[PDB]
Coordinates of C-alpha atoms and ligand atoms in Angstrom, one line a residue:
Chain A
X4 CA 0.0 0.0 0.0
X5 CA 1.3 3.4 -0.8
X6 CA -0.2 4.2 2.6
X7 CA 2.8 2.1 4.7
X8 CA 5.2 4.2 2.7
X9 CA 4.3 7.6 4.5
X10 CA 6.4 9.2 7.0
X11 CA 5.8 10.2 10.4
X12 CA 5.3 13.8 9.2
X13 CA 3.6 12.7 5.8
X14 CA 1.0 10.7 8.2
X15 CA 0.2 13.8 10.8
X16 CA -0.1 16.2 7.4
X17 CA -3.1 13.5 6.1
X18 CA -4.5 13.4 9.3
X19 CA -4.4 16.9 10.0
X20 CA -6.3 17.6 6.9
X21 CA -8.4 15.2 7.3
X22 CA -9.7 16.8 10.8
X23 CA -13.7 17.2 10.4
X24 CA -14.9 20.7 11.1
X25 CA -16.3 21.7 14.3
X26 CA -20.1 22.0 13.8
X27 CA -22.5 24.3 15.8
X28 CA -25.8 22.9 17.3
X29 CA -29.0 23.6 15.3
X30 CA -31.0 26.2 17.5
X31 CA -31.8 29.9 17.5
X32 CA -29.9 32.0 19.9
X33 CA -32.7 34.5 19.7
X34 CA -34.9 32.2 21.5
X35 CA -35.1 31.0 25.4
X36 CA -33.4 27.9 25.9
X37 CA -36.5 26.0 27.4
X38 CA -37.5 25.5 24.1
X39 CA -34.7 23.2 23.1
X40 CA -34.9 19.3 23.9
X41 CA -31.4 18.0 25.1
X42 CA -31.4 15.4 23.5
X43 CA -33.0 16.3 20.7
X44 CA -29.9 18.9 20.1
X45 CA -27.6 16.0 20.8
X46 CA -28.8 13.9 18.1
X47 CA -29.4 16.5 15.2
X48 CA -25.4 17.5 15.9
X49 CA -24.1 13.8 16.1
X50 CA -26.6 13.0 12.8
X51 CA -24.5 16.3 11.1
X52 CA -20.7 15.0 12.5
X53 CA -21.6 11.4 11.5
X54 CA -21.1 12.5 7.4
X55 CA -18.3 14.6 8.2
X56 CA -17.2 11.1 9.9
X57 CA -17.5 9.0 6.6
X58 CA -15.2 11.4 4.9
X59 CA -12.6 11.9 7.5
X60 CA -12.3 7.7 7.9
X61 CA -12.1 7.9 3.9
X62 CA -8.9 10.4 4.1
X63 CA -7.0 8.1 6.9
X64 CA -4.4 6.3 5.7
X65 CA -4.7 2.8 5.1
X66 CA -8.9 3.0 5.5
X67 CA -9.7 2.7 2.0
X68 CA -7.6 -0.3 1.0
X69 CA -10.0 -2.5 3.0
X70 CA -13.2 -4.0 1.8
X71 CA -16.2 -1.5 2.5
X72 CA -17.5 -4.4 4.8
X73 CA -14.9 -4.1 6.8
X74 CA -14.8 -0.7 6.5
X75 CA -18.7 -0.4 7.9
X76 CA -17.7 -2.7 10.4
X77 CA -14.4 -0.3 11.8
X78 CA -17.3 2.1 11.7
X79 CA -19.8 0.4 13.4
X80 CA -17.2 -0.3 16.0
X81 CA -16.0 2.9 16.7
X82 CA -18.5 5.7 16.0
X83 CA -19.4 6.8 19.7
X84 CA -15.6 6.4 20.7
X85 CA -14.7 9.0 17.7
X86 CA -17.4 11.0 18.4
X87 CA -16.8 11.3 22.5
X88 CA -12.6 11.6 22.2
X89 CA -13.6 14.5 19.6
X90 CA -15.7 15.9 22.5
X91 CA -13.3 15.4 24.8
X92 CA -10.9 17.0 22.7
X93 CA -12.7 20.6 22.4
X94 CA -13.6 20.6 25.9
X95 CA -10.0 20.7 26.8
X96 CA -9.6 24.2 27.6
X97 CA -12.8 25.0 29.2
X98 CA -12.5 22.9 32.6
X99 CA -15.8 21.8 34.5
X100 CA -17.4 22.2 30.9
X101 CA -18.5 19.5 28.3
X102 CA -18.5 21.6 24.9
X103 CA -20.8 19.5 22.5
X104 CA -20.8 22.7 20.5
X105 CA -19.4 26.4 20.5
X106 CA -23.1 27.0 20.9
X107 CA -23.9 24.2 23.4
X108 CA -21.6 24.4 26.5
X109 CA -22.7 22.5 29.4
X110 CA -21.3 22.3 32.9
X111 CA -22.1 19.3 35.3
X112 CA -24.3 12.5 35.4
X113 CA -22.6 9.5 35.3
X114 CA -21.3 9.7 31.8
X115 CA -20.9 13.4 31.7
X116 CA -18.6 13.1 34.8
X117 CA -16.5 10.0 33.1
X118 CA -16.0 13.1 30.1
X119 CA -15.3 15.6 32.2
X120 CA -12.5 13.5 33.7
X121 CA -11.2 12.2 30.5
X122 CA -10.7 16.2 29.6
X123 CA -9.1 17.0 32.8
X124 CA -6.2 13.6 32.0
X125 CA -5.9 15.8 28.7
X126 CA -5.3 18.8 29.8
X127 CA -2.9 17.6 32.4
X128 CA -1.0 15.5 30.0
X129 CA -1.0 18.4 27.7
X130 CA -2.1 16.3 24.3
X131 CA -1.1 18.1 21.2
X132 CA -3.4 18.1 18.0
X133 CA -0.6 16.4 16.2
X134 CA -1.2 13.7 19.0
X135 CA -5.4 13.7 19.3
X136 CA -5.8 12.9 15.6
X137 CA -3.2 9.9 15.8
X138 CA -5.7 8.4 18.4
X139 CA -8.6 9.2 16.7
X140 CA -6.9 7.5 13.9
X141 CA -6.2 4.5 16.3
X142 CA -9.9 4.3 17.7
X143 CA -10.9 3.9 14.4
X144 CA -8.7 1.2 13.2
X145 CA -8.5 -0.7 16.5
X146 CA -12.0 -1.0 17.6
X147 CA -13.3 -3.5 15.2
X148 CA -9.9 -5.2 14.0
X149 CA -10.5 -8.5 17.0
X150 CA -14.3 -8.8 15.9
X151 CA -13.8 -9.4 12.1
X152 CA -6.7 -12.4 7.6
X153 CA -4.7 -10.0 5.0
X154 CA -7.4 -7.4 5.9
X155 CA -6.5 -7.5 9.5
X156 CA -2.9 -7.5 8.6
X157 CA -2.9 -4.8 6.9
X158 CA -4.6 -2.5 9.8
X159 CA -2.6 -3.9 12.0
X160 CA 0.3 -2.8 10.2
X161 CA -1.3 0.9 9.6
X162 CA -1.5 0.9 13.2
X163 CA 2.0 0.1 13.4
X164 CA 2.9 3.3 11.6
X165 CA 0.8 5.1 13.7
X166 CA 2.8 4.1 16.6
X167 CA 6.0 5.2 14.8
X168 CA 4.5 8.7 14.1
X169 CA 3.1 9.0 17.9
X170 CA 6.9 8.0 18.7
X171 CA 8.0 10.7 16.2
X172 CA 6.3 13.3 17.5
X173 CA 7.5 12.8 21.3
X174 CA 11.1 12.5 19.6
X175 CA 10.2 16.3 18.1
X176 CA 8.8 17.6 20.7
X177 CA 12.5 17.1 22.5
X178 CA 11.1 14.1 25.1
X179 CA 13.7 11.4 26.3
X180 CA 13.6 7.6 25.3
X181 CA 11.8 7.1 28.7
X182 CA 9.7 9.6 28.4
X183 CA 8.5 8.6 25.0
X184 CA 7.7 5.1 25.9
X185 CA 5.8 6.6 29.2
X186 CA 3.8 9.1 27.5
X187 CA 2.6 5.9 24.7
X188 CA 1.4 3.8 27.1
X189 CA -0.4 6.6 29.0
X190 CA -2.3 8.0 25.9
X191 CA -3.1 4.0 25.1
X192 CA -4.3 3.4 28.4
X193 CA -6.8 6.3 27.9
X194 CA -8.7 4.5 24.7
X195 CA -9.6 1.6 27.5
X196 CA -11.3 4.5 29.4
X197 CA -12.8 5.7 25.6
X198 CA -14.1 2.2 25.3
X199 CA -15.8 1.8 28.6
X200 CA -17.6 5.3 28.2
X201 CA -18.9 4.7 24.8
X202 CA -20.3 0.7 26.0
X203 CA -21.5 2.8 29.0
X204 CA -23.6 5.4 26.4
X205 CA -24.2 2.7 24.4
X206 CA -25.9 1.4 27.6
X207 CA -28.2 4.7 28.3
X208 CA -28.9 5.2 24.5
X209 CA -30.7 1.7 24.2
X210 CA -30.7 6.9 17.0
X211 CA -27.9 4.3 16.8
X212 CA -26.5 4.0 12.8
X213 CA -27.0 0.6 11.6
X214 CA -24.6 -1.4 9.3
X215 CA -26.8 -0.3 6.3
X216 CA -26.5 3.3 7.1
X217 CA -23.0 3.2 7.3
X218 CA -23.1 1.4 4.1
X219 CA -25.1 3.9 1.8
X220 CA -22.8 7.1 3.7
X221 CA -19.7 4.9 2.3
X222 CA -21.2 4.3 -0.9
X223 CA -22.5 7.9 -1.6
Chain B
X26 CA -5.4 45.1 9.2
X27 CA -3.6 48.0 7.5
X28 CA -0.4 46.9 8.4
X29 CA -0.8 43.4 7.5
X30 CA 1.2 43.1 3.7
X31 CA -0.3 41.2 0.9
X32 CA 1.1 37.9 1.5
X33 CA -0.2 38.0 5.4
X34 CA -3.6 39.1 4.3
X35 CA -3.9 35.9 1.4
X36 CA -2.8 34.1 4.6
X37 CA -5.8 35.6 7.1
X38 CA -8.0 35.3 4.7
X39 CA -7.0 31.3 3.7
X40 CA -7.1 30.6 7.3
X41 CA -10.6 32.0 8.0
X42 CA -12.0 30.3 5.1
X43 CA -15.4 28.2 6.6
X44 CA -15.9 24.3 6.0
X45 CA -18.0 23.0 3.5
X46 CA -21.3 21.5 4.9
X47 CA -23.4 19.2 3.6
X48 CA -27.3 19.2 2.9
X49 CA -29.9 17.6 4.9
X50 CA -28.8 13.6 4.9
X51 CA -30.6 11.0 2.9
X52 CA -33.9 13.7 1.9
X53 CA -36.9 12.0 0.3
X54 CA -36.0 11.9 -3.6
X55 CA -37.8 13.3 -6.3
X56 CA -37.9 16.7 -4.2
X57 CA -40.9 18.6 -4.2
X58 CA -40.2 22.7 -4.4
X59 CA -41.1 22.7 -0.6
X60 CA -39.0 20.0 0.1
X61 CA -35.7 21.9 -1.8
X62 CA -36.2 25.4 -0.3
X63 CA -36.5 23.2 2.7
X64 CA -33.3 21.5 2.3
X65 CA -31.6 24.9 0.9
X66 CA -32.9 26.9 3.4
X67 CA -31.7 24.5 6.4
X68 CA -28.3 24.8 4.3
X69 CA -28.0 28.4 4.4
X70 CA -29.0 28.8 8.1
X71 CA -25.7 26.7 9.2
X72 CA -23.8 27.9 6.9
X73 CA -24.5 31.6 8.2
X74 CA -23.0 30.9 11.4
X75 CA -19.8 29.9 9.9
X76 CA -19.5 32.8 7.8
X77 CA -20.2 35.4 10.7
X78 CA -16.7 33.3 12.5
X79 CA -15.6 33.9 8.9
X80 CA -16.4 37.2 8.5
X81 CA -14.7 38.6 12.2
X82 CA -11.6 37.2 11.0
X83 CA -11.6 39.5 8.1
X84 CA -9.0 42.2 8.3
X85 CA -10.8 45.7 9.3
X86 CA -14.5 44.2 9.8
X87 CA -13.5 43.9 13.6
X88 CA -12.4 47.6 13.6
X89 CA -15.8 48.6 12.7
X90 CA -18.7 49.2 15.2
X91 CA -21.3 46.4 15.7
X92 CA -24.4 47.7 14.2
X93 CA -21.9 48.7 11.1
X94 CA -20.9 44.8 11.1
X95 CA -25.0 44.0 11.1
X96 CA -25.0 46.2 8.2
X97 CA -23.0 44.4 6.2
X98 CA -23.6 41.6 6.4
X99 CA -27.1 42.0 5.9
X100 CA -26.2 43.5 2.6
X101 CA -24.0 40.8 1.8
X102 CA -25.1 37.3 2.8
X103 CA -26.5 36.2 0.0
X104 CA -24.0 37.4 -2.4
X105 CA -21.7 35.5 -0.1
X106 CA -23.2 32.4 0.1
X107 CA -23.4 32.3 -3.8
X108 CA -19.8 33.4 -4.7
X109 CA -19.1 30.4 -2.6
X110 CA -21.6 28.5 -4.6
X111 CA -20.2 29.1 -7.9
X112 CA -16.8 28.7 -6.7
X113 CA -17.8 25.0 -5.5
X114 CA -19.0 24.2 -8.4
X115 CA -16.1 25.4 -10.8
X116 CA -15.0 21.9 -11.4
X117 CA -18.6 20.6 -11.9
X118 CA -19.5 21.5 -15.4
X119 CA -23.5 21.8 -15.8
X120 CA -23.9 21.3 -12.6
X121 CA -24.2 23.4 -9.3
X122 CA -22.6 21.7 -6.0
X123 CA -24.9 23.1 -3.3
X124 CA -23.5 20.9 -1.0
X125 CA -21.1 17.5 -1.6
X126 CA -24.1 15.2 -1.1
X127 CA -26.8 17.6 -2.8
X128 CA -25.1 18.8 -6.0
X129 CA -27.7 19.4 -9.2
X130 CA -28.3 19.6 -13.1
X131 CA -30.1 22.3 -14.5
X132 CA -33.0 19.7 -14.7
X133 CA -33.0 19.6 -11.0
X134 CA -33.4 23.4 -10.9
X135 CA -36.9 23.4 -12.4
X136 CA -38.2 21.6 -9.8
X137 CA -38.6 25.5 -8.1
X138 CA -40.2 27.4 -10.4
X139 CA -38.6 30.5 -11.8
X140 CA -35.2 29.3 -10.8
X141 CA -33.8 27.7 -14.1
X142 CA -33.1 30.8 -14.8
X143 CA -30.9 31.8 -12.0
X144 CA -29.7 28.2 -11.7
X145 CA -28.4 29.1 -15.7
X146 CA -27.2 32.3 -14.6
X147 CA -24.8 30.3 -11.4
X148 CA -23.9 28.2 -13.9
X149 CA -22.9 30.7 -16.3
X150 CA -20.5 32.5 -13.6
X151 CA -19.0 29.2 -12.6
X152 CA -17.5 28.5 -16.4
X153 CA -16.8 32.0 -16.0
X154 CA -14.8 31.7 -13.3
X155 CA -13.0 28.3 -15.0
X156 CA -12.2 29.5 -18.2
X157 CA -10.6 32.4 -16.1
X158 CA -8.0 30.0 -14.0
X159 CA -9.6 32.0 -10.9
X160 CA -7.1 31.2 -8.0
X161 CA -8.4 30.3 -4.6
X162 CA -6.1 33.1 -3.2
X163 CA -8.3 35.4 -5.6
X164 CA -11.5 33.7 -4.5
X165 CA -10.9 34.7 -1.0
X166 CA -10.0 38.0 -1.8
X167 CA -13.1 38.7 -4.0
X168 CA -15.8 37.3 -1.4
X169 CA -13.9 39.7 1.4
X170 CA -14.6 42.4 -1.0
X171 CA -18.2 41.7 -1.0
X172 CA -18.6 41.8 2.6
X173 CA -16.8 45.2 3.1
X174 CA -18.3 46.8 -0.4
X175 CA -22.0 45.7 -1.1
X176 CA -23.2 47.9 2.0
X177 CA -21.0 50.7 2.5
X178 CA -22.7 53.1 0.0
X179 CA -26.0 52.6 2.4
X180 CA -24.8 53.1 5.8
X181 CA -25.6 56.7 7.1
X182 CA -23.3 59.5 7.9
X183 CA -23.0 62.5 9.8
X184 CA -21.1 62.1 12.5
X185 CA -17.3 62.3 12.1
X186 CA -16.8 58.9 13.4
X187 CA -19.2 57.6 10.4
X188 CA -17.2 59.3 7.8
X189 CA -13.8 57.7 9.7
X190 CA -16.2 53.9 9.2
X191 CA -16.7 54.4 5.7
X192 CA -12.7 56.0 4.8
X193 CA -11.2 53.0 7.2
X194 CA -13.3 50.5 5.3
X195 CA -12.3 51.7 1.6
X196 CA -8.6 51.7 2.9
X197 CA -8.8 48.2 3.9
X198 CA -10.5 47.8 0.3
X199 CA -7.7 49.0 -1.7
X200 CA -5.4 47.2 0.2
X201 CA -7.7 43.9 -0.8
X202 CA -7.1 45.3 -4.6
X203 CA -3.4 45.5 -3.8
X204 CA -3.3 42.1 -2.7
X205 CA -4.9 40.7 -5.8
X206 CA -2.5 42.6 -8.0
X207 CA 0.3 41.5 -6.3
X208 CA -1.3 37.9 -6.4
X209 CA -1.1 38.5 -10.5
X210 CA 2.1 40.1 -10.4
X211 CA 4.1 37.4 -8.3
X212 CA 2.1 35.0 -11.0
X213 CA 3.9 36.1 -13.8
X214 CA 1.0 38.8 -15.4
X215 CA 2.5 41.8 -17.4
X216 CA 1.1 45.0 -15.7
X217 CA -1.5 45.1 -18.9
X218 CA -2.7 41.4 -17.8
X219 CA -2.8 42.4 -14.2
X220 CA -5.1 45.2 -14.4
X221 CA -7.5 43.6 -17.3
X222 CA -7.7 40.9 -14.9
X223 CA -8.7 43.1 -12.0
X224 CA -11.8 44.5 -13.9
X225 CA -12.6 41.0 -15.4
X226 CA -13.1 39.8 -12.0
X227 CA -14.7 42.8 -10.5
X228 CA -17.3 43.3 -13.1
X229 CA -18.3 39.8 -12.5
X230 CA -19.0 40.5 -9.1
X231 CA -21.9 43.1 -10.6
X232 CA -23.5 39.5 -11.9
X233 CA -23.1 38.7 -8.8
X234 CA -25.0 41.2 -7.2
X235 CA -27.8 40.9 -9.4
X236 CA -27.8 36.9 -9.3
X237 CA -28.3 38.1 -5.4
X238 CA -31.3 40.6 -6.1
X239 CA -33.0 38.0 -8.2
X240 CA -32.7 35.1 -5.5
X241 CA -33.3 37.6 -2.6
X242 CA -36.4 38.4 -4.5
X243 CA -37.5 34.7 -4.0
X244 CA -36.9 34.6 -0.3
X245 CA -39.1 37.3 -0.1
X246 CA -41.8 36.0 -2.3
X247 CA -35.8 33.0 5.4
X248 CA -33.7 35.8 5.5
X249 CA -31.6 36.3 8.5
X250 CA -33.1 39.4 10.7
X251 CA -31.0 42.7 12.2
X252 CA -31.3 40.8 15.8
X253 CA -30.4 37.3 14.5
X254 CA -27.1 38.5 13.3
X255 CA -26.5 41.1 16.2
X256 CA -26.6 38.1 18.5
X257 CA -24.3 35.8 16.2
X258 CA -21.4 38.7 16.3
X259 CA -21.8 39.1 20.1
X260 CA -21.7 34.8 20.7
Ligands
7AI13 O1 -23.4 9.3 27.1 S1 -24.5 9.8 26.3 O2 -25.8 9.1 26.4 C1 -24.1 10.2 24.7 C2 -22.7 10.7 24.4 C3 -22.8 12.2 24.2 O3 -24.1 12.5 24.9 C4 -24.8 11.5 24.2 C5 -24.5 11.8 22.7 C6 -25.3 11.5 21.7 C7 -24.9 10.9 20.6 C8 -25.7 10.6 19.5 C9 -27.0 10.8 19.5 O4 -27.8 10.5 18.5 C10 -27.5 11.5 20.6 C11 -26.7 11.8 21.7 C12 -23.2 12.3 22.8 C13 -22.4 13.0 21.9 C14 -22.9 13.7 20.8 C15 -22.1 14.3 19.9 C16 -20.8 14.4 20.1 O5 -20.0 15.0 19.3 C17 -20.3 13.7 21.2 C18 -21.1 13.1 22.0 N1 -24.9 11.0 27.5 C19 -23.8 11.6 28.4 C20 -23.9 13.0 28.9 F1 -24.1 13.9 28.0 F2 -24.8 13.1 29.9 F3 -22.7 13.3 29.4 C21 -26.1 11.5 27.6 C22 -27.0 10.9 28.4 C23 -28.3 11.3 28.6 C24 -28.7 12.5 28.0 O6 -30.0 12.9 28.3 C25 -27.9 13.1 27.2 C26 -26.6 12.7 27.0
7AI14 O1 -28.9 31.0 -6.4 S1 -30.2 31.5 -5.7 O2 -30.7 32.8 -6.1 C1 -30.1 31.1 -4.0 C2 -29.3 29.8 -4.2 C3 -30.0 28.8 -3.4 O3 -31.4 29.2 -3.7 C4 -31.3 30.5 -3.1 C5 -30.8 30.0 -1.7 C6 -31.4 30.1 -0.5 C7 -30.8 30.8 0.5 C8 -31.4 30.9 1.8 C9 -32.5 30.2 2.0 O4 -33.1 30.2 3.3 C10 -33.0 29.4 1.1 C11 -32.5 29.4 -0.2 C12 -29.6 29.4 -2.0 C13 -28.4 29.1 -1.5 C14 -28.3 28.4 -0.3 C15 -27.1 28.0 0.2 C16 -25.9 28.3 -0.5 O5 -24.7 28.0 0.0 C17 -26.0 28.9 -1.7 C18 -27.2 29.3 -2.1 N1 -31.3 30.4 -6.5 C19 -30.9 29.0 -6.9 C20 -30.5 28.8 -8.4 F1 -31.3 29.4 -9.2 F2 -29.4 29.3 -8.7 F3 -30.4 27.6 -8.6 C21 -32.5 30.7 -6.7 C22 -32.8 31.4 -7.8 C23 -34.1 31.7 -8.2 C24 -35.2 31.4 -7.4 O6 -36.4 31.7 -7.8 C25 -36.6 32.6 -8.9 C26 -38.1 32.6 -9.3 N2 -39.1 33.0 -8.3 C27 -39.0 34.5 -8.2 C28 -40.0 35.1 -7.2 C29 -41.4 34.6 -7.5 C30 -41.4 33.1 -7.5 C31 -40.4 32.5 -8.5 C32 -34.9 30.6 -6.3 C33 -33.6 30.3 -6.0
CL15 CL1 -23.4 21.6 9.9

């Protein structure tokens, strides 16, 4: 694949251009907030970020040499993760604060608290763009790879590489051998946390999208 | 804003340039007119949100005063939204890419009636625009003209600090013509190529306008109100 042939800098370029926009929740500011269903809000914006999705999984290295099956599956896998590490991500710098939005900040259960804790660990840690979209990247690719053999070869190689440019990075940004190896496993251990949260939304949401949705947004 | 040189204002104006949303998700196909200006006008409603980010990241609209910001963009939204239009659809021939997953034939257009005709006239600018090599450093340019120009000759004056509005605004203006020129002459354009080029690509911007009259005429037969857009500068 022409994908295993990228650099470390080559792969953080793709990914970075890749990056979905961040949309705005669907509401007018003119009006009292009463009006507005939570939920309903919720699910209009992840609906809108779920085709911006499609296209940014289409644009990550290695995504398109597998079988759209496969690629559905990675998708079905992962969709709640990507979408709750993106949250994560933007709430960052706004502590106590979930920002679904620009327009739709919350402060402070269960879930919302796990989130909020996940931000803190991020902004603590002090996680880089260049590092939050090789994760994302990971989420992605990992998620579905031990529910499924050249198919999973190949991600697991991808995923390889994306190791190598996490690696890269720490090596740029002036960090010792130790620390490199340290700061790895910590950002790793994180996607276990990513994985519990989403199985625990999962949980409260049984709006879901189905294999055939994810199908037809591949296909179109 | 006045200080910035060309180079750093094609780089402002790149960096502040909005994403590219996309229509409504899997709509119910044939449309019905309802169902299109539905889908258009839930289109146009995000994408004013964006643009109003967009347009406070334009160098000199800040410097202005708030209701002066309403002002223009109220002239301008429209003509904004369908610069970017034509622009998206350069590399589309026949065809008008409203968003990536609602892009349309002319025989799409008649499904509104009246709009063929505009829809013809869209399409008509976009060749325009790709038989003309337009740049997307250009592109920027031109739609940061249309927010600063198509409602300064309305605004009201007076007061000394109205007249300072209107003279800071033409300044950044001619610095936006500047940049564009040297945009042309860093191309490789003789000075004779540079300034044809200039009035090739402002005189389209008249079609513009009136592409903007015509379809602003529709919405009235939607459009974002004083207060809507007061509050969307202030957030
Ligand atoms: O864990 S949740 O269930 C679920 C995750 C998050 O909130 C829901 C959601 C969503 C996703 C898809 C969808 O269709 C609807 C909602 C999220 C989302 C959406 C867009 C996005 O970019 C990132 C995340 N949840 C947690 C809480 F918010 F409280 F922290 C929750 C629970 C009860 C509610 O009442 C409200 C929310
Ligand atoms: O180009 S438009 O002028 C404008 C484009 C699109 O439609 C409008 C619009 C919009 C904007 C806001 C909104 O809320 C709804 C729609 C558009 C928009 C949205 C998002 C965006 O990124 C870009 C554009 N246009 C479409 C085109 F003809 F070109 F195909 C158009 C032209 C003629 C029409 O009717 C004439 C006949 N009529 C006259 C009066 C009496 C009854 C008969 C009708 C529409
Ligand atoms: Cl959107």
């Amino acid at each position: 694949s022409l994908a295993l042939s990228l650099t470390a800098d080559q792969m953080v370029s793709a990914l970075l251009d890749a990056e979905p926009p961040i949309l705005y929740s669907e509401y007018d500011p003119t009006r009292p907030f009463s009006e507005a269903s939570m939920m309903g809000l919720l699910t209009n914006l992840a609906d809108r970020e779920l085709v911006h999705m499609i296209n940014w999984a289409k644009r990550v290295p290695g995504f398109v040499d597998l079988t759209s099956h496969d690629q559905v599956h990675l998708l079905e896998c992962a969709w709640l993760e990507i979408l709750m590490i993106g949250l994560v991500w933007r709430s960052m710098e706004h502590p106590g604060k979930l920002l679904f939005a620009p327009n739709l900040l919350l402060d402070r259960v269960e879930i919302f608290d796990m989130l909020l804790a996940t931000s803190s660990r991020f902004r603590m840690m002090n996680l880089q763009g260049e590092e939050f979209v090789c994760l994302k990247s990971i989420i992605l690719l990992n998620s579905g790879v031990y529910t499924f053999l050249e198919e999973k070869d190949h991600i697991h190689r991808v995923l390889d590489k994306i190791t190598d440019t996490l690696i890269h990075l720490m090596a740029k940004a002036g960090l010792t051998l130790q620390q490199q190896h340290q700061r790895l496993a910590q950002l790793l251990l994180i996607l276990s946390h990513i994985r519990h949260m989403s199985n625990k939304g999962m949980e409260h949401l049984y709006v879901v999208p189905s294999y055939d949705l994810l199908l037809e947004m591949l296909d179109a």
